[PDB]
């Protein structure tokens, strides 16, 4: 700054921290519903697919984790047919774990 200002170079960066990064599996990236259009194409596709992801990430001097959420429908349904009892059915649609 001023009349003796030193020759200079610029650094641009950002933060956002309470966030976690999202990628909708949706034919355009909008929320048009909870059960996306591609999520329905993969039903009528009737076929198995594998997946690779490669994340490029800044080096850190300490061991760190990538945390993934495969976004999914994890759900329960609950039935109560007599005074003594409760019966629950669980489902998890991609990434299932039985019943």
């Amino acid at each position: 700054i001023g009349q003796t200002a030193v020759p200079s170079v610029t650094q641009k960066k950002f933060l956002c921290d309470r966030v976690m990064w999202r990628i909708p599996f949706s034919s355009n990236f909008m929320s048009m519903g909870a059960l996306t259009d591609l999520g329905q194409n993969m039903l009528y596709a009737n076929s198995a697919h594998a997946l690779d992801m490669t994340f490029e990430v800044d080096p850190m001097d300490e061991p760190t984790l990538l945390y993934l959420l495969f976004e999914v429908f994890d759900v329960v349904r609950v039935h109560q047919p007599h005074r003594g009892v409760i019966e629950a059915v669980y489902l998890r649609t991609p990434f299932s774990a039985g019943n």
């Binding site: 990064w21 490669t54 993934l68 976004e71």
Partner: peptide, 24 residues
């Protein structure tokens, strides 16, 4: 600085997408 990952073959019906973040 590259962190590759793969999921074994499965079915993606009703799949919703990904969220991701970095932890220590």
């Amino acid at each position: 600085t590259n962190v590759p990952i793969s999921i074994p073959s499965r079915n993606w019906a009703a799949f919703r997408g990904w969220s991701f973040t970095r932890l220590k």
